[PDB]
Motif scaffolding. Structure first.
Motif, short mmCIF file in Angstrom:
data_model
loop_
_atom_site.label_atom_id
_atom_site.label_comp_id
_atom_site.label_asym_id
_atom_site.label_seq_id
_atom_site.Cartn_x
_atom_site.Cartn_y
_atom_site.Cartn_z
N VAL B 2 0.84 -1.19 0.00
CA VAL B 2 0.00 0.00 0.00
C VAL B 2 0.87 1.25 0.00
N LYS B 3 0.36 2.33 -0.58
CA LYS B 3 1.10 3.58 -0.70
C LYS B 3 0.62 4.57 0.35
N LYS B 4 1.57 5.14 1.10
CA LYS B 4 1.35 6.19 2.08
C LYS B 4 1.60 7.57 1.47
N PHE B 5 1.08 8.59 2.15
CA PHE B 5 1.34 9.98 1.81
C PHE B 5 2.05 10.67 2.96
N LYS B 6 2.77 11.73 2.63
CA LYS B 6 3.25 12.65 3.65
C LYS B 6 2.08 13.38 4.30
N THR B 16 -3.97 5.86 2.81
CA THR B 16 -3.13 4.95 2.04
C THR B 16 -3.89 4.51 0.80
N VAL B 17 -3.15 4.23 -0.28
CA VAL B 17 -3.76 3.87 -1.55
C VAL B 17 -3.08 2.63 -2.10
N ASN B 197 -4.53 -9.08 -5.29
CA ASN B 197 -4.68 -7.80 -4.58
C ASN B 197 -4.86 -8.02 -3.08
N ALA B 198 -4.01 -8.88 -2.52
CA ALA B 198 -4.12 -9.27 -1.12
C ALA B 198 -3.85 -8.12 -0.15
N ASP B 199 -3.32 -6.99 -0.63
CA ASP B 199 -3.11 -5.81 0.21
C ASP B 199 -4.36 -4.96 0.38
N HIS B 200 -5.45 -5.30 -0.31
CA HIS B 200 -6.68 -4.53 -0.23
C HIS B 200 -7.04 -4.18 1.21
N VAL B 204 -6.04 2.24 4.26
CA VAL B 204 -6.62 3.12 5.27
C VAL B 204 -7.34 4.24 4.53
N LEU B 205 -8.67 4.27 4.64
CA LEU B 205 -9.45 5.23 3.88
C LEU B 205 -8.94 6.65 4.12
N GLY B 206 -8.76 7.02 5.39
CA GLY B 206 -8.05 8.22 5.74
C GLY B 206 -8.93 9.40 6.09
#
Ligand SMILES: [Mg+2]
Ligand SMILES: [Mg+2]
Ligand SMILES: [Mg+2]
Ligand SMILES: [Mg+2]
Ligand SMILES: [Mg+2]
Ligand SMILES: [Mg+2]
Ligand SMILES: [Mg+2]
Ligand SMILES: [Mg+2]
Ligand SMILES: [Mg+2]
Ligand SMILES: [Mg+2]
Ligand SMILES: [Mg+2]
Ligand SMILES: [Mg+2]
Ligand SMILES: [Mg+2]
Ligand SMILES: [Mg+2]
Ligand SMILES: [Mg+2]
Ligand SMILES: [Mg+2]
Ligand SMILES: [Mg+2]
Ligand SMILES: [Mg+2]
Ligand SMILES: [Mg+2]
Ligand SMILES: [Mg+2]
Ligand SMILES: [Mg+2]
Ligand SMILES: [Mg+2]
Ligand SMILES: [Mg+2]
Ligand SMILES: [Mg+2]
Ligand SMILES: [Mg+2]
Ligand SMILES: [Mg+2]
Ligand SMILES: [Mg+2]
Ligand SMILES: [Mg+2]
Ligand SMILES: [Mg+2]
Ligand SMILES: [Mg+2]
Ligand SMILES: [Mg+2]
Ligand SMILES: [Mg+2]
Ligand SMILES: [Mg+2]
Ligand SMILES: [Mg+2]
Ligand SMILES: [Mg+2]
Ligand SMILES: [Mg+2]
Ligand SMILES: [Mg+2]
Ligand SMILES: [Mg+2]
Ligand SMILES: [Mg+2]
Ligand SMILES: [Mg+2]
Ligand SMILES: [Mg+2]
Ligand SMILES: [Mg+2]
Ligand SMILES: [Mg+2]
Ligand SMILES: [Mg+2]
Ligand SMILES: [Mg+2]
Ligand SMILES: [Mg+2]
Ligand SMILES: [Mg+2]
Ligand SMILES: [Mg+2]
Ligand SMILES: [Mg+2]
Ligand SMILES: [Mg+2]
Ligand SMILES: [Mg+2]
Ligand SMILES: [Mg+2]
Ligand SMILES: [Mg+2]
Ligand SMILES: [Mg+2]
Ligand SMILES: [Mg+2]
Ligand SMILES: [Mg+2]
Ligand SMILES: [Mg+2]
Ligand SMILES: [Mg+2]
Ligand SMILES: [Mg+2]
Ligand SMILES: [Mg+2]
Ligand SMILES: [Mg+2]
Ligand SMILES: [Mg+2]
Ligand SMILES: [Mg+2]
Ligand SMILES: [Mg+2]
Ligand SMILES: [Mg+2]
Ligand SMILES: [Mg+2]
Ligand SMILES: [Mg+2]
Ligand SMILES: [Mg+2]
Ligand SMILES: [Mg+2]
Ligand SMILES: [Mg+2]
Ligand SMILES: [Mg+2]
Ligand SMILES: [Mg+2]
Ligand SMILES: [Mg+2]
Ligand SMILES: [Mg+2]
Ligand SMILES: [Mg+2]
Ligand SMILES: [Mg+2]
Ligand SMILES: [Mg+2]
Ligand SMILES: [Mg+2]
Ligand SMILES: [Mg+2]
Ligand SMILES: [Mg+2]
Ligand SMILES: [Mg+2]
Ligand SMILES: [Mg+2]
Ligand SMILES: [Mg+2]
Ligand SMILES: [Mg+2]
Ligand SMILES: [Mg+2]
Ligand SMILES: [Mg+2]
Ligand SMILES: [Mg+2]
Ligand SMILES: [Mg+2]
Ligand SMILES: [Mg+2]
Ligand SMILES: [Mg+2]
Ligand SMILES: [Mg+2]
Ligand SMILES: [Mg+2]
Ligand SMILES: [Mg+2]
Ligand SMILES: [Mg+2]
Ligand SMILES: [Mg+2]
Ligand SMILES: [Mg+2]
Ligand SMILES: [Mg+2]
Ligand SMILES: [Mg+2]
Ligand SMILES: [Mg+2]
Ligand SMILES: [Mg+2]
Ligand SMILES: [Mg+2]
Ligand SMILES: [Mg+2]
Ligand SMILES: [Mg+2]
Ligand SMILES: [Mg+2]
Ligand SMILES: [Mg+2]
Ligand SMILES: [Mg+2]
Ligand SMILES: [Mg+2]
Ligand SMILES: [Mg+2]
Ligand SMILES: [Mg+2]
Ligand SMILES: [Mg+2]
Ligand SMILES: [Mg+2]
Ligand SMILES: [Mg+2]
Ligand SMILES: [Mg+2]
Ligand SMILES: [Mg+2]
Ligand SMILES: [Mg+2]
Ligand SMILES: [Mg+2]
Ligand SMILES: [Mg+2]
Ligand SMILES: [Mg+2]
Ligand SMILES: [Mg+2]
Ligand SMILES: [Mg+2]
Ligand SMILES: [Mg+2]
Ligand SMILES: [Mg+2]
Ligand SMILES: [Mg+2]
Ligand SMILES: [Mg+2]
Ligand SMILES: [Mg+2]
Ligand SMILES: [Mg+2]
Ligand SMILES: [Mg+2]
Ligand SMILES: [Mg+2]
Ligand SMILES: [Mg+2]
Ligand SMILES: [Mg+2]
Ligand SMILES: [Mg+2]
Ligand SMILES: [Mg+2]
Ligand SMILES: [Mg+2]
Ligand SMILES: [Mg+2]
Ligand SMILES: [Mg+2]
Ligand SMILES: [Mg+2]
Ligand SMILES: [Mg+2]
Ligand SMILES: [Mg+2]
Ligand SMILES: [Mg+2]
Ligand SMILES: [Mg+2]
Ligand SMILES: [Mg+2]
Ligand SMILES: [Mg+2]
Ligand SMILES: [Mg+2]
Ligand SMILES: [Mg+2]
Ligand SMILES: [Mg+2]
Ligand SMILES: [Mg+2]
Ligand SMILES: [Mg+2]
Ligand SMILES: [Mg+2]
Ligand SMILES: [Mg+2]
Ligand SMILES: [Mg+2]
Ligand SMILES: [Mg+2]
Ligand SMILES: [Mg+2]
Ligand SMILES: [Mg+2]
Ligand SMILES: [Mg+2]
Ligand SMILES: [Mg+2]
Ligand SMILES: [Mg+2]
Ligand SMILES: [Mg+2]
Ligand SMILES: [Mg+2]
Ligand SMILES: [Mg+2]
Ligand SMILES: [Mg+2]
Ligand SMILES: [Mg+2]
Ligand SMILES: [Mg+2]
Ligand SMILES: [Mg+2]
Ligand SMILES: [Mg+2]
Ligand SMILES: [Mg+2]
Ligand SMILES: [Mg+2]
Ligand SMILES: [Mg+2]
Ligand SMILES: [Mg+2]
Ligand SMILES: [Mg+2]
Ligand SMILES: [Mg+2]
Ligand SMILES: [Mg+2]
Ligand SMILES: [Mg+2]
Ligand SMILES: [Mg+2]
Ligand SMILES: [Mg+2]
Ligand SMILES: [Mg+2]
Ligand SMILES: [Mg+2]
Ligand SMILES: [Mg+2]
Ligand SMILES: [Mg+2]
Ligand SMILES: [Mg+2]
Ligand SMILES: [Mg+2]
Ligand SMILES: [Mg+2]
Ligand SMILES: [Mg+2]
Ligand SMILES: [Mg+2]
Ligand SMILES: [Mg+2]
Ligand SMILES: [Mg+2]
Ligand SMILES: [Mg+2]
Ligand SMILES: [Mg+2]
Ligand SMILES: [Mg+2]
Ligand SMILES: [Mg+2]
Ligand SMILES: [Mg+2]
Ligand SMILES: [Mg+2]
Ligand SMILES: [Mg+2]
Ligand SMILES: [Mg+2]
Ligand SMILES: [Mg+2]
Ligand SMILES: [Mg+2]
Ligand SMILES: [Mg+2]
Ligand SMILES: [Mg+2]
Ligand SMILES: [Mg+2]
Ligand SMILES: [Mg+2]
Ligand SMILES: [Mg+2]
Ligand SMILES: [Mg+2]
Ligand SMILES: [Mg+2]
Ligand SMILES: [Mg+2]
Ligand SMILES: [Mg+2]
Ligand SMILES: [Mg+2]
Ligand SMILES: [Mg+2]
Ligand SMILES: [Mg+2]
Ligand SMILES: [Mg+2]
Ligand SMILES: [Mg+2]
Ligand SMILES: [Mg+2]
Ligand SMILES: [Mg+2]
Ligand SMILES: [Mg+2]
Ligand SMILES: [Mg+2]
Ligand SMILES: [Mg+2]
Ligand SMILES: [Mg+2]
Ligand SMILES: [Mg+2]
Ligand SMILES: [Mg+2]
Ligand SMILES: [Mg+2]
Ligand SMILES: [Mg+2]
Ligand SMILES: [Mg+2]
Ligand SMILES: [Mg+2]
Ligand SMILES: [Mg+2]
Ligand SMILES: [Mg+2]
Ligand SMILES: [Mg+2]
Ligand SMILES: [Mg+2]
Ligand SMILES: [Mg+2]
Ligand SMILES: [Mg+2]
Ligand SMILES: [Mg+2]
Ligand SMILES: [Mg+2]
Ligand SMILES: [Mg+2]
Ligand SMILES: [Mg+2]
Ligand SMILES: [Mg+2]
Ligand SMILES: [Mg+2]
Ligand SMILES: [Mg+2]
Ligand SMILES: [Mg+2]
Ligand SMILES: [Mg+2]
Ligand SMILES: [Mg+2]
Ligand SMILES: [Mg+2]
Ligand SMILES: [Mg+2]
Ligand SMILES: [Mg+2]
Ligand SMILES: [Mg+2]
Ligand SMILES: [Mg+2]
Ligand SMILES: [Mg+2]
Ligand SMILES: [Mg+2]
Ligand SMILES: [Mg+2]
Ligand SMILES: [Mg+2]
Ligand SMILES: [Mg+2]
Ligand SMILES: [Mg+2]
Ligand SMILES: [Mg+2]
Ligand SMILES: [Mg+2]
Ligand SMILES: [Mg+2]
Ligand SMILES: [Mg+2]
Ligand SMILES: [Mg+2]
Ligand SMILES: [Mg+2]
Ligand SMILES: [Mg+2]
Ligand SMILES: [Mg+2]
Ligand SMILES: [Mg+2]
Ligand SMILES: [Mg+2]
Ligand SMILES: [Mg+2]
Ligand SMILES: [Mg+2]
Ligand SMILES: [Mg+2]
Ligand SMILES: [Mg+2]
Ligand SMILES: [Mg+2]
Ligand SMILES: [Mg+2]
Ligand SMILES: [Mg+2]
Lengths: 48, 275
Positions: B2-6, B16-17, B197-200, B204-206
């Motif tokens: 999953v991808k995080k943001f600053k 997270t996306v 896509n096991a990381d679904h 984190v909606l956020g």
RNA sequence: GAGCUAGCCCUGGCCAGGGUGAAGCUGGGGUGAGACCCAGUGGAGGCCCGAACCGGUGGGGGAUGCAAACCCCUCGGAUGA
RNA sequence: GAAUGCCGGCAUGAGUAACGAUAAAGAGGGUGAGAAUCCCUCUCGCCGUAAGCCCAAGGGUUCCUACGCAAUGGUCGUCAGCGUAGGGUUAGGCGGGACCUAAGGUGAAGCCGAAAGGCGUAGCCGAAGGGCAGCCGGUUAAUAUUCCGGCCCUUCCCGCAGGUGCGAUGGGGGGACGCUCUAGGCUAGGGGGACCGGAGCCAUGGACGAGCCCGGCCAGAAGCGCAGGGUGGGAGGUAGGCAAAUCCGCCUCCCAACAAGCUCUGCGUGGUGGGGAAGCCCGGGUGACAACCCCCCGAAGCCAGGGAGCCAAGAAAAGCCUCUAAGCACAACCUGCGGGAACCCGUACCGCAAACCGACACAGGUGGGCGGGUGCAAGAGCACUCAGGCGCGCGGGAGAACCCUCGCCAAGGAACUCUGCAAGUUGGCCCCGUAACUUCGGGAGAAGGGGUGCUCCCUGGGGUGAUGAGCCCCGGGGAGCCGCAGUGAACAGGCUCUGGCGACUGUUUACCAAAAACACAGCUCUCUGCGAACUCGUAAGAGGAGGUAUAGGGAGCGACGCUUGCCCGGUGCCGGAAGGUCAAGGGGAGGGGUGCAAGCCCCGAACCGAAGCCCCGGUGAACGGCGGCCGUAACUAUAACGGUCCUAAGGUAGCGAAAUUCCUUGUCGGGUAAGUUCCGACCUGCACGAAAAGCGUAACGACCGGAGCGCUGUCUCGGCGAGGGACCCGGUGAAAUUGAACUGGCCGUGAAGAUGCGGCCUACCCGUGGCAGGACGAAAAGACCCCGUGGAGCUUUACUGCAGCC
RNA sequence: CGAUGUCGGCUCGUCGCAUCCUGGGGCUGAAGAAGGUCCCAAGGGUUGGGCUGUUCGCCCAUUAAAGCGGCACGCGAGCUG
RNA sequence: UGGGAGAGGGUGGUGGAAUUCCCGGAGUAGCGGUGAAAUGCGCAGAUACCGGGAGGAACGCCGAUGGCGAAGGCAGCCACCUGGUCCACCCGUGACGCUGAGGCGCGAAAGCGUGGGGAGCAAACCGGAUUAGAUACCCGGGUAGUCCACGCCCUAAACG
RNA sequence: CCGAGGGUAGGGCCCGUGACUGGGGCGAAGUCGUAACAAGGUAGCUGUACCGGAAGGUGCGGCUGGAU
């Protein structure tokens, strides 16, 4: 402020019109009653 | 992964996306999309029957092949893996050497350019479909049917699967994703491998805004209403539940089993779920 | 009776200008390879300032009203639930 | 004669309040019985992201002209959206229909329901979405993309010529799509010109001038040019696109490929047709044979189905192209040309409003497009102003109190008050600079301070050109000038320290509460194996979901950090093939009525006989609960320690006079000259406590506390000034209320608060501006409180039912 | 109870006197100065702040003094709230 | 250059024994546990026995005073990828070295975060005992955790 | 112009002090229990974790500086 009556001819004819009343039991009773009372206009007038 | 943001907004701190790594084609096959009709949680009476629904992003429904026994022996090249908004799993586009084009749900590890095929004679490799009777005991499968020729019903969500456990007559024994142990008719088709896509679930909606994009309207607690609305309504100030915790409609909501006990499938369910 | 109002569905439209400057990208440093760091490029965000627009915080006025909820000053949001 | 009775009429309040934005008026001339109010001229003011223009709704003749003024118009009226009458709306191309589909509605087949009716794939209806052929100018009192002029185009029918396997409601392609950012080239629109056209002007000290003022374009088929959009070509194989297929799909080979070619659109040009200013003159004439050119700025519009990035992954169907099937290949279709044919409805006028929604010519509400110029960093902000439209349908005086909105204020500066409520201060841009803490983003515009106009000289880079001049843009350095003051006007944060509550952006009691409430990402329990659970419906049928346990429902908690103890006796839920109880039913020992009888009829024991309950057990992020007493340490005080009653078990960590503390302004410390509030501590917590979560926590808050600095008419303590009222005169002219009234003070009395009764006192008659102590003043048959064997919402281990489930 | 608006403040007063002060007194365990206590006397006067909604009260700095009560716990067709 | 030994490290697979749980059979009055007992389990059929199934963890004999690594540490078996080290030949290079403040990396166990997995065991916790008392040592239960991946933590009688 | 310094504002370092609070040292003439030294009556010690009036205990892994 925005009041309640916001005229709309398509809304008027499609809600209170002759063909709406005729489609339903309660609607025909409205027409039976209004004809029995002698209403000059059985249904609202819309410029259509 | 999953991808995080600053944390350059309050909500980007936790948002997270999906990385969308396995995606190779950003547009859906024109012949296989059709308009998905937004219900808003309302039924043919126009009444809400599922609360807090609607207002999410517009979508088209990509048609999925949930049979595959359609085309036994006819192989197909895995042409593309795409984003399907209507499900958590990704979809893979198959070009059959038939010329026919179809979507399936994309298994974990399916590679673009690979060939797969459905049938009693198919190899035991990810993406292939067979009746369960001809899948080696112990291998993990997905897109399982529940009855023969009725469509794939089990193990369809991102990262899920089911494991064959043994054979008892015309039936196989599956461990469903839920831990349940169930008999399934052997002539039901499955697909070797787990759904991708096991990381679904690590997403984190956020922010409240994100739930809205998905068509999830805000959920209103019973304890925040009034007696006319909900068993948990009323009370001066805050209030504990003051009764067995109940639904909007008054049935008990902590432990009360709700399956119909005389259901005919009980004859086929070996063991109720775990966890 | 949903031409007011509440939610949803379908289909259209609108949001001056200014500021901040995320990821990524390239270059440079670094290293066994990297992490990483610096500059440049970039243009993200229920981001910032502020009209339209949507509101209605505080105060004054009005109170047989201009008005059966209005007026002035001030104030909140303004790419987003 | 009373019912706050009903209907009607007419009074009182009263010549009173008011006459609906404080954008504003003056004069002259005309008309006329009558003029502040109608027309006309000059001067003045107001709007100009509108208070101007166009369009959709909605309204329905309000449009134009003549003639009128009873009523309507808040005054007036000669005027009018008013009265009477006559006139006025012109389309193959604009909008809708003879086209398409969206949600939705309807509904052949089919399904369900006592009836009425409810559903329902196809199909049909359904638009502001798809699709489709017209632009400029002129003309009328009033319509114009509709009439006319010029130049263009679409469809249908028939015919001709050439061409082709023609042919569809069937197959395929396409139509066909998000958000944000954005390139290149254009156009709309705009600015300048020393250049081109133009009626004239020279004032009042100067100017006959690169003078002032005015204007310098619009539409246009083919072709051409510039810019973009779209599309690869050929062969073979072919089992898929519910028949067929040469089409499409798929595989392979070959050239071609960011090219060209083909096609399509925009812009320019373009035969031709138009327009054409100020000024003068009585809407028109002239200007004028008007000119019609160069330069800069430049879209959010156009080329467009462009490009990139991103995740939330972004209608359909027809028109269109292609493929074939019957059929038909004398047909049929395609392409060019020609002639004929082309229907129905709308079109006036208002349209941010005096014509729409608000009972009114109502300061409110109303969707889309155009919305010029200059200056202020920008802009749709602000000031002024163009075109255009207005001065708000009562006026004239006066110069009191009081009220409203506004301006200034000596000294002080929050002393005001519940509170700095309100109002000051601050205020844009550019530069310097900036703390605790922090989740490293922020906090931050922190705080604080300096700059800011004009003139002259030198000067760096960019855009357009060309590389240059010109224009336009971004700068830099010197030397000067003025004033109280240079964002010289208008628009434009006061700031800081410290607590509470909520993580945050959001949401709410339309019309007394915007919050600490709701929501919220996130956390946990729980249910649900798919014809899912669950929800709506009698049902069919729907939603859930065209989803499948990384999913869907229900519940609590509420970012994040560190955590979340003990009690399962009671209630709930879950697990438990034993046992106890247990309904209909089965069974028939036994007993009964009757009959002469065979027989018929009735009662009925044991025993078998479900769920449920009882019973056994599990279970707290299930309902919930979480003690008392006596005694003990080298002084007192206290009790680590022991004893004992009770309990299902006796509150752990952390916090604590708190949004919780009664006693209470607890005590102590801090701040203040002084602090019932505030912050920090202490702990005998009346009556914190761990997901009705506990304790913290950066950032955030029109939330609620406490303090300070700045600055102030908040105040000491008030003064003056401005406009709109109030007042006076002319015009129009309400209201609630009202038993009747010839309606004074005191001390008494009186149903206990007297203008009205007694006694005394005071007092000529009637008004106007003012003030509010009384008339237990007006308003609403008290909301509080009680009463009524009155009502309604809500709750539950009240009663009794019902649905639902077993 | 077909309504007599209920705390506190502000403004505006007016009255009683069981007098806080100022004037006149007697007694004193009144040397003086300063008090104590009672009598006469209501003419006038009776301050500004911190806390708290407060009335009250405490406290700060003064003062000749910082009086107590009535008037629908005076006064909301006068204001605040 | 040509050889050797090895639980050195990494990844992927895979075998058997035992424990526990569930289903079937058969069988009955106790089982378990201790120093002795009790809690607990068991006529709702336990234990003991046979068959089947599931699951995690750890690798008996070999095993030794052994081997390996710089240390921490490494033990079923197969393979792949990879480290260090010893040997004999005396072939090549020509002092290229030793050490090493900072730095960088590794670093048992417990503990942390995110997600799995959970048989046995077992902090905390509950009960039974023992005891003068017994918040222990013993007994019956039992949650983190113990295991896998990724990221931290950086400690030790990290000792010779 | 520079300029002693004065003024406004904001930071850094040190010192003294502070209601209250944490443990530390010493005292010993007390209260509890007995954790360590013997196999110290549960071999000890240890890092870490969790817990208990207290010494301490238990888990995990480690060391012998452990008697028989
Ligand atoms: Mg409307
Ligand atoms: Mg109407
Ligand atoms: Mg209409
Ligand atoms: Mg309409
Ligand atoms: Mg309508
Ligand atoms: Mg109708
Ligand atoms: Mg009528
Ligand atoms: Mg008639
Ligand atoms: Mg009718
Ligand atoms: Mg990935
Ligand atoms: Mg993030
Ligand atoms: Mg980022
Ligand atoms: Mg990150
Ligand atoms: Mg945040
Ligand atoms: Mg995803
Ligand atoms: Mg991503
Ligand atoms: Mg992916
Ligand atoms: Mg389609
Ligand atoms: Mg669909
Ligand atoms: Mg649907
Ligand atoms: Mg429907
Ligand atoms: Mg319906
Ligand atoms: Mg609904
Ligand atoms: Mg629901
Ligand atoms: Mg819903
Ligand atoms: Mg999540
Ligand atoms: Mg969505
Ligand atoms: Mg949710
Ligand atoms: Mg909620
Ligand atoms: Mg509530
Ligand atoms: Mg309701
Ligand atoms: Mg109810
Ligand atoms: Mg209820
Ligand atoms: Mg409740
Ligand atoms: Mg309550
Ligand atoms: Mg409540
Ligand atoms: Mg209450
Ligand atoms: Mg409460
Ligand atoms: Mg409540
Ligand atoms: Mg509540
Ligand atoms: Mg609440
Ligand atoms: Mg309650
Ligand atoms: Mg509760
Ligand atoms: Mg309760
Ligand atoms: Mg089944
Ligand atoms: Mg739309
Ligand atoms: Mg906007
Ligand atoms: Mg930048
Ligand atoms: Mg990039
Ligand atoms: Mg926002
Ligand atoms: Mg924003
Ligand atoms: Mg923004
Ligand atoms: Mg903002
Ligand atoms: Mg307001
Ligand atoms: Mg204010
Ligand atoms: Mg004011
Ligand atoms: Mg007011
Ligand atoms: Mg009102
Ligand atoms: Mg206003
Ligand atoms: Mg504002
Ligand atoms: Mg504002
Ligand atoms: Mg804003
Ligand atoms: Mg904006
Ligand atoms: Mg958006
Ligand atoms: Mg949106
Ligand atoms: Mg009578
Ligand atoms: Mg009356
Ligand atoms: Mg009356
Ligand atoms: Mg009457
Ligand atoms: Mg009447
Ligand atoms: Mg009067
Ligand atoms: Mg004004
Ligand atoms: Mg007149
Ligand atoms: Mg007249
Ligand atoms: Mg006129
Ligand atoms: Mg103006
Ligand atoms: Mg009308
Ligand atoms: Mg007319
Ligand atoms: Mg008239
Ligand atoms: Mg008249
Ligand atoms: Mg009139
Ligand atoms: Mg009027
Ligand atoms: Mg006349
Ligand atoms: Mg009129
Ligand atoms: Mg005429
Ligand atoms: Mg025409
Ligand atoms: Mg026709
Ligand atoms: Mg249409
Ligand atoms: Mg058309
Ligand atoms: Mg044209
Ligand atoms: Mg007209
Ligand atoms: Mg006309
Ligand atoms: Mg053909
Ligand atoms: Mg066709
Ligand atoms: Mg589509
Ligand atoms: Mg569209
Ligand atoms: Mg043009
Ligand atoms: Mg310009
Ligand atoms: Mg032009
Ligand atoms: Mg060009
Ligand atoms: Mg074929
Ligand atoms: Mg002309
Ligand atoms: Mg001429
Ligand atoms: Mg000429
Ligand atoms: Mg724009
Ligand atoms: Mg594009
Ligand atoms: Mg996504
Ligand atoms: Mg798309
Ligand atoms: Mg469709
Ligand atoms: Mg044929
Ligand atoms: Mg052809
Ligand atoms: Mg016709
Ligand atoms: Mg017509
Ligand atoms: Mg017209
Ligand atoms: Mg408006
Ligand atoms: Mg408008
Ligand atoms: Mg008008
Ligand atoms: Mg009204
Ligand atoms: Mg008017
Ligand atoms: Mg109006
Ligand atoms: Mg213009
Ligand atoms: Mg400005
Ligand atoms: Mg500006
Ligand atoms: Mg503005
Ligand atoms: Mg101008
Ligand atoms: Mg006026
Ligand atoms: Mg006067
Ligand atoms: Mg002053
Ligand atoms: Mg001050
Ligand atoms: Mg001052
Ligand atoms: Mg304050
Ligand atoms: Mg600070
Ligand atoms: Mg920082
Ligand atoms: Mg932030
Ligand atoms: Mg500043
Ligand atoms: Mg600050
Ligand atoms: Mg000047
Ligand atoms: Mg202004
Ligand atoms: Mg300003
Ligand atoms: Mg500001
Ligand atoms: Mg202020
Ligand atoms: Mg602060
Ligand atoms: Mg808090
Ligand atoms: Mg909040
Ligand atoms: Mg809140
Ligand atoms: Mg928080
Ligand atoms: Mg929150
Ligand atoms: Mg929030
Ligand atoms: Mg917002
Ligand atoms: Mg309300
Ligand atoms: Mg409200
Ligand atoms: Mg209301
Ligand atoms: Mg209301
Ligand atoms: Mg309000
Ligand atoms: Mg409110
Ligand atoms: Mg707010
Ligand atoms: Mg709420
Ligand atoms: Mg909330
Ligand atoms: Mg949480
Ligand atoms: Mg259905
Ligand atoms: Mg469904
Ligand atoms: Mg469905
Ligand atoms: Mg689903
Ligand atoms: Mg909430
Ligand atoms: Mg922290
Ligand atoms: Mg405890
Ligand atoms: Mg319990
Ligand atoms: Mg229980
Ligand atoms: Mg109960
Ligand atoms: Mg049960
Ligand atoms: Mg038995
Ligand atoms: Mg018998
Ligand atoms: Mg008998
Ligand atoms: Mg728990
Ligand atoms: Mg209880
Ligand atoms: Mg509870
Ligand atoms: Mg307690
Ligand atoms: Mg306390
Ligand atoms: Mg507290
Ligand atoms: Mg309390
Ligand atoms: Mg109390
Ligand atoms: Mg007490
Ligand atoms: Mg208290
Ligand atoms: Mg109190
Ligand atoms: Mg005190
Ligand atoms: Mg006191
Ligand atoms: Mg306070
Ligand atoms: Mg307070
Ligand atoms: Mg105490
Ligand atoms: Mg609750
Ligand atoms: Mg609470
Ligand atoms: Mg807030
Ligand atoms: Mg707030
Ligand atoms: Mg004043
Ligand atoms: Mg003045
Ligand atoms: Mg004045
Ligand atoms: Mg005036
Ligand atoms: Mg005046
Ligand atoms: Mg007079
Ligand atoms: Mg009389
Ligand atoms: Mg009386
Ligand atoms: Mg009296
Ligand atoms: Mg009298
Ligand atoms: Mg009398
Ligand atoms: Mg008498
Ligand atoms: Mg008398
Ligand atoms: Mg008298
Ligand atoms: Mg009065
Ligand atoms: Mg009165
Ligand atoms: Mg009276
Ligand atoms: Mg009165
Ligand atoms: Mg009164
Ligand atoms: Mg009433
Ligand atoms: Mg009544
Ligand atoms: Mg009453
Ligand atoms: Mg009453
Ligand atoms: Mg009462
Ligand atoms: Mg009764
Ligand atoms: Mg009674
Ligand atoms: Mg009753
Ligand atoms: Mg009732
Ligand atoms: Mg149920
Ligand atoms: Mg009363
Ligand atoms: Mg009355
Ligand atoms: Mg009354
Ligand atoms: Mg004296
Ligand atoms: Mg003396
Ligand atoms: Mg005396
Ligand atoms: Mg006196
Ligand atoms: Mg007096
Ligand atoms: Mg006080
Ligand atoms: Mg008090
Ligand atoms: Mg003195
Ligand atoms: Mg009293
Ligand atoms: Mg009094
Ligand atoms: Mg009292
Ligand atoms: Mg009173
Ligand atoms: Mg009063
Ligand atoms: Mg009042
Ligand atoms: Mg009052
Ligand atoms: Mg009154
Ligand atoms: Mg009064
Ligand atoms: Mg007040
Ligand atoms: Mg109040
Ligand atoms: Mg061994
Ligand atoms: Mg060894
Ligand atoms: Mg050699
Ligand atoms: Mg480690
Ligand atoms: Mg470890
Ligand atoms: Mg952990
Ligand atoms: Mg376990
Ligand atoms: Mg004891
Ligand atoms: Mg724990
Ligand atoms: Mg944990
Ligand atoms: Mg661990
Ligand atoms: Mg050792
Ligand atoms: Mg000095
Ligand atoms: Mg010992
Ligand atoms: Mg020992
Ligand atoms: Mg020991
Ligand atoms: Mg402890
Ligand atoms: Mg203790
Ligand atoms: Mg322990
Ligand atoms: Mg070791
Ligand atoms: Mg020893």
């Amino acid at each position: 402020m925005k009041r309640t009556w916001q005229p709309n001819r398509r809304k008027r004819a499609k809600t209170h019109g002759f063909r709406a009343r005729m489609r339903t039991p309660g609607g025909r009773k409205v027409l039976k009653r209004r004809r029995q009372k002698g209403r000059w206009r059985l249904t609202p007038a819309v410029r259509k | 992964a999953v991808k995080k943001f600053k944390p350059y907004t309050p909500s980007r701190r936790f948002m997270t996306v999906a990385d969308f790594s396995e995606i190779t084609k950003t547009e859906p096959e024109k012949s296989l999309v059709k308009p998905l009709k937004k219900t808003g949680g309302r039924n043919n009476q126009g009444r809400i029957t599922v609360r807090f629904r609607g207002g999410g992003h517009k979508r088209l429904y990509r048609i999925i092949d949930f049979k595959r026994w359609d085309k036994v022996g006819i192989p197909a090249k895995v042409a593309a893996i795409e984003y399907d908004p209507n499900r958590s799993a990704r979809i893979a586009l198959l070009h059959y050497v038939d010329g026919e084009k179809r979507y399936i749900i994309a298994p974990d590890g399916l590679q673009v350019g690979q060939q797969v095929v459905a049938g009693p004679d198919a190899p035991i490799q990810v993406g292939n479909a067979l009746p369960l009777r001809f899948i080696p005991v112990g291998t993990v499968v997905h897109a399982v049917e529940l009855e023969p020729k009725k469509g794939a019903k089990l193990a369809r969500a991102a990262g899920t699967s089911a494991q064959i456990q043994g054979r008892e007559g015309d039936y196989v024994i599956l461990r469903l994703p839920s831990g349940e142990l169930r008999k399934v008719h052997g002539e039901c088709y499955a697909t070797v491998g787990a759904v991708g896509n096991a990381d679904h679930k690590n997403i984190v909606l956020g922010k409240a805004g994100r739930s809205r994009w998905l068509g999830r309207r805000p959920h209103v607690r019973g304890a925040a209403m009034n007696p006319v609305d909900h068993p948990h309504g009323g009370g001066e100030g805050r209030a504990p539940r003051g009764r067995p915790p109940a639904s909007p409609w008054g049935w008990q909501t902590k432990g009360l089993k709700t399956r119909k006990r005389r259901k005919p499938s009980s004859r086929f369910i070996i063991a109720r779920r775990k966890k």
